Design a protein around this nucleic acid. Sequence first.
RNA 1: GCGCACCGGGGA
RNA 2: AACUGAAGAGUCCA
RNA 3: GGACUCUUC
Length: 1726
Amino acid sequence: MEEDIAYVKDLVSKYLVDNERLSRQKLAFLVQTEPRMLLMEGLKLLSLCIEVDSCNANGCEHNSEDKSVEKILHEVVPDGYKLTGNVLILLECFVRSSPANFEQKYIEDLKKLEQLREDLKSVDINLIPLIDGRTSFYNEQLPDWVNDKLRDTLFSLLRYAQESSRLCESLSMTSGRLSGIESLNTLLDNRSDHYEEIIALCHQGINNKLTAHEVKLQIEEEYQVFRNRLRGGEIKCQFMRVNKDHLLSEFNKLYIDDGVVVEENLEQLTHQFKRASPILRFLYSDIEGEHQMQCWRSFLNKVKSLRILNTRRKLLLIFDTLILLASKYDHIKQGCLQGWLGSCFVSVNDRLVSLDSTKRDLKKWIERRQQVELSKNQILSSIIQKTIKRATAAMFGVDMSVIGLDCYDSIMNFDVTGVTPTISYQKSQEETFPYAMGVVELSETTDLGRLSSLSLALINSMKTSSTVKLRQNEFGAARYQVVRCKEAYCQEFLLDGVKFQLVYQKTGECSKCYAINNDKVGEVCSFYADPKRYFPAIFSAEVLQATVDTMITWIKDCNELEKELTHIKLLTKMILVLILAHPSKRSQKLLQNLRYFIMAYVSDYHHVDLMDKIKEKLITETEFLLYKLIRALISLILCNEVKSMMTNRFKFILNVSYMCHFITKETPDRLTDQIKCFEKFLEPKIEFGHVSVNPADIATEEELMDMAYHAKKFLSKEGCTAPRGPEYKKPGVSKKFLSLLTSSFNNGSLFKEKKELRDPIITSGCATALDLASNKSVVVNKYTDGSRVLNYDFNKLTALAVTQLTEVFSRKGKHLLNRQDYEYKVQQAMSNLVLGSQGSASLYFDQLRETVQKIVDQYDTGKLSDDVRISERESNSEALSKALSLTNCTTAMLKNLCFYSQESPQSYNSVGPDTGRLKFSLSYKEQVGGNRELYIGDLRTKMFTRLIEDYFEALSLQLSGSCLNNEKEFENAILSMKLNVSLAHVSYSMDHSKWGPMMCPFLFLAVLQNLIFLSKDLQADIKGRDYLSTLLTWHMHKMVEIPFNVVSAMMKSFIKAQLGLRKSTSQSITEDFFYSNFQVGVVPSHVSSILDMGQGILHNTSDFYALISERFINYAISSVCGGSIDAYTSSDDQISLFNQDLTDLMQRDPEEFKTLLEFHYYMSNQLNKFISPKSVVGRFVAEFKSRFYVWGDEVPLLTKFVAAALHNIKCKEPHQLAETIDTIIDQSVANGVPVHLCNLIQLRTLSLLQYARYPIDPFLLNCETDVKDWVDGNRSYRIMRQIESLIPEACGKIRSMLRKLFNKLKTGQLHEEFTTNYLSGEHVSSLKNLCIILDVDPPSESDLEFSWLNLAAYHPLRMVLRQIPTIVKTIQNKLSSTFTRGAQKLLSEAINKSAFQSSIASGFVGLCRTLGSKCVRGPNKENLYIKSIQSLISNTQGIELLTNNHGIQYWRVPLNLKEEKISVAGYFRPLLWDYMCISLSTAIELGAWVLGEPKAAKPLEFFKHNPCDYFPLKPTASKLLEDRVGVNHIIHSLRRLYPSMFEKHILPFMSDLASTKMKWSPRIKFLDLCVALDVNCEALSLVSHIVKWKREEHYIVLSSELRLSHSRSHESDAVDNFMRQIYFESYVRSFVATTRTLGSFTWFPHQRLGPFSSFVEKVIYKGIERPMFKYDLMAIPLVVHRGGLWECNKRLASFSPVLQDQDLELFVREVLLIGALSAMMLDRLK
RNA sequence: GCGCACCGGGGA
RNA sequence: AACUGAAGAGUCCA
RNA sequence: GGACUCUUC
Ligand SMILES: Cc1ncnc2c1c(I)cn2[C@@H]1O[C@H](COP(=O)(O)OP(=O)(O)OP(=O)(O)O)[C@@H](O)[C@@H]1F
């Protein structure tokens, strides 16, 4: 309060323009100490400074002395004047924020001027009214951040002290326009000696003012020394000429010292393959191939799923006895033997329960009732009878005869004999296998079909719900050997008429032991598996064969591979079946590196360490088998005898390497992945030297000295002039090369076209709150005693690790491990001391006892484990919605949350703001072949780093060469790569190792401190560079948190190693780091270091550095040796397109070219950029962002996009799954995959849906598509094209009617007979009437009966839980997202929706669960199984079912059932009506060709297939600029048609236009129709299709499949809308031509301009708000009078649009009308 | 026969 | 009681 | 405008 008022008195005094007019108000604002008087003076001063630039904007002279109208006339009270000649310009200004109130004030001003217009214009001088109403207190007389600081204080005065008014509330409307970095002045600057030290480091020995001559003389003396010491052997070469003969020999011998055999032929290789593993033994072996039992079983599963849980031992056994009774009854009557496996039978919950023990258990149970008091034969029946009544109570249904429950004497003499089911937990030789292994051929699809059935049973094993497993199998040490299953779980599958059973014991998603079991032979095989990894092979037996056949067609023409095609096909199929049977991550990586191998092979130079990068650590036998198969395949295709068709073989092998995508992304183990990610984070820092363990918010002195020391060490890299020479592998940037890079940026040598940067504080993007909101994660700090917690507790962590070790001992070590030995005694002693829960070793155990006793005094496991954590997690939206509940502004921008919020920092240092330092946290990413460490900062960190990124993206977009935030630049890069490979020019396909882990914010700080952006004005330049220096130093001192699991695992490992409980004494660096700290007594919680920018955190910042540094490197090389380079970078990726002279030099003197490549390597490394070993130089192929470009062909990644669609996509309802697969397949077709393979993938998805027991309606997938259904259509077109094949006769009549209709609506003729007649009501009568009124034969009565079953008709499907128009809502949300209350409503809705969606079971297993439950909502508040609906349809008479070949179900429902009391007639929807609606909406979107006649192709040209005839194609379209209907059109139409609802819902949220339509909008026909329909009928939205259009991205399609596709064919206003308003407005009220008046008109662009070309093109666009003058346009403002531009009573210029028949309707529809008409006509002549 | 950071998972 | 920062595209929803 | 899914870095 009292301090804030003094602060703003100082701020206004210090910062304010020296204008005398404002001075009088400034001297009065500094003295009114009364808070009300201070507030009034402040508002007055803001109003004066707003009205003083508007007068300087519109040219009017300011009435400083409030000269009344009489005063100026002699020489009510205006705010301006320009009276000259007969032209008087009266200006008045105001500031209102409410768009409703704005109108009131504007009307008042109009009245105040119009009450004297007549009197003034009566005698001599004519009046020209002018208004400059503003919507906020912007006031650029004050500097930008002050307008926010002053506004906040001014508002707070009345909000806190003036409690005695809510009218001028623009004091809440935020008045800023910039990024928000400048708001750091609102905080106190406490930057002490440390900041000065860091900056002095950044500015020491670095001479950034070199001229181009000094730079070019210093850069050609690095080259002489480098070249001489490279020829002399003192510098290690890093690039090797490609041999193609010594490079294959290197892949063959890659694993020679791991024991792999020298070589093998196919016969031994196939023999090994068909026997390697239990699955692979089983896939190629020789398998050599109603009932009351199911009625009880299928009925008792429901009974326990609808009754009490925790079914006791007694209750489950009754179900076993009942199933046995049913089985005996079926045996006696029917004479059948199914449902058994030897002497075990399938009981209720998959349970493979055994007869002998089920009989034996019943012997004891009945014997109990002998002493418990009719007889045994009657007592057991009464047990079942009591259960039977209770089971039936929960309301049979399915048939279930009760007569099979008479007595139990049958059990007493029931004997079933057979084999026993077993699981072998230990490895068994391939001699116990009972089938002739290796018989099934590979040339067919028998093996891919057995994997499909077996994989499906591995996925189904995750659905079993865990229940009590009485009757254990084995005891002691036999439990992990051959186990005789007395009670397990089983899943039955059926292979070629043989009933196999997958037998397991553990229920869940974890890795288990499975055993395949047969009724004739007992166990078949056993294995260990993680079921979640086995989904892609399900129902894909035909996709995975067409994939291999497609790849083989590529190489079928190589005449010198003509005798080797059979082996190549065999080997490819072997590779595919191996990676599908054994989904290993170490095989994923091995298949992935093959793309780098082949990329090197086709290229010219490669890194010397390439083959150390390709090598992968293999473990199992199948991984070495996979390497053997890959070696054989490559050795076949890449022979030196084969020379022709190299492009096809590169394509082939690259797709073989992309087969790695058939293995799931998910982590095989989480803890290992997390430990490895942390090792990746920590190892580079330990190797550098800087790991500051456990930093604090108030950084100590030792930490600061360490950071300064290592910052100094970062910059001291040496190169090629030191005796040791350049030292790669060392992080750092030189000083010579830093002061050359900045010396030539500050010189206009890098970016020349001579350049003109512009200040990136002004041009930086402004980020709202919702830009940073999502459902992703964010760290939440934990506070105790009011201070953030940053340290794990050693006592609590030690106790927790001891408890975990005790648990693991109890499960595993207690029952094994030679219980009289050392380790048993040690871990027993360590386990007794844990209470509550259900040598140096002596000293350490003493300490451990003390610590655990201390903790158990303090507390017993859940609380401890939650008290060790130091962080929590939320979503971005939860944190933001909590944050916006603290701010006090209207607009929700980031600057309002960091600096002007309630919990915002107050002072700041160079280490961090008042509210702690920036803090991240670590997690891991699940990706294909590799570990990514992920940094999740808390909310404040995310906001501040977002400000940094906005700044550096603003810089990067001003310089040409970065493809990170520039799609035009990326397309130019693609075109340049294509042209380069076309001419056979060299092209270096670069890649950078350790982008994140090596570049640091200190490097960016040094570079920023030495760069000069605006060399015209230096003060603002240095000030902005200062703001960014501060923000980048906050990232120098960030604290990265060590995950909880990592420290917990490390402490368990520590305790084990301390007690001696470990085999070896090998320790990686990370374990040393953790153990050194655990010994002294401190837990490493957070880590600070000089390195590690963060993976993708400073992404735009590092992209900017990459851009400028690469530009310097290419410039240096061009200066050194001729030529040139064209580099496109994308922040860790680069493509360098060499010149033609460099390409020639490669052939002239290849030693010189290798010297130039080595010099490029050296210069890059001296600037902290380590080129990856996966970097090639070549003339054959290019590479940028996984997009390969060979010369005379296209490279489709067929296997990546086939494999994308086959995975367990996390989808929740059966229509979402179909839409997802449609999208993936659209992507595939766009990227080279043929279409006949896409149809197979769609059939695979439909089969997955059918397995789930879902009715397959015509609206799921179209599995008969062409090329044209993807290139030219969208999803709605594919739905049309499926319905047009189900009922092709009627759709012809519907399309004839639609062609006749759509043509009339667009013209605008038949609107009422469509709108409010026959798009509402009974659908069939509507369709008939529409056909009648257009003179088209109506659909026959039979055609109107076709229907489709809509199971979500009444309400969407109720999915199991694991745990106002739409047009107005659309525009409302779009306009309201930028307001605090609007953002809060959106955020709250998203939070609740996400909390609901997270509890829904997702995936194939969840889909089957959902569709097996009561998922169909009945008409009036009830739930029914899908089977209930299908049964009621089956009973009802007349409803037929029809199906096409694929399985698409369309019904036939007579048109009298809805009347005739049919409860299942409300689920059906007529199919022609839906066809009409789909066809109409997609004709609005795609075009009018959709309504033409489908004509099949009659090619008959007898051409060759040519499988690699790929052809780029573009979706042909007709409307590009004609139908660019935007949001403004819909807003204007909505206001015109529905005013009250518009002003109730859309007016408050509307700005940047402020309702300045002036009633000259075009009044679009066919848009008002759509708007009127969407307000009324909310079933179909036509307006969302008008604003939608098919993109013009290219599709790479086979040129043969393009010929077989069907053929169908039927058939600037943005600028002119601006010109339209000016020409018609001028007549009613002549207006002044200024920047604010012209831009005020709603229609306005954001030398064909003609009359206003000069001002709009540059003057308006640049930002100078000046009046348009006669000096331009070929100091007196030009008043726009009726029909021409006027200067002094004469039309010095004239403007006129092309008036039309409809344009004149607006002008004559405006309510002096004749006078306006008369003057209009005279102008039209000239 | 899984995981394969020595450490976990593999019958309530 | 675990999985980020961006880029492109598509689908759905109100 | 929000959500979701694929590919990329
Ligand atoms: C911020 C972020 N969040 C999640 N994912 C990210 C990133 C970033 I920046 C890159 N990626 C992805 O990581 C894969 C390549 O990883 P990459 O092949 O480079 O492994 P690597 O160990 O660094 O190999 P080199 O150092 O020898 O180049 C690839 O999907 C993509 F690049």
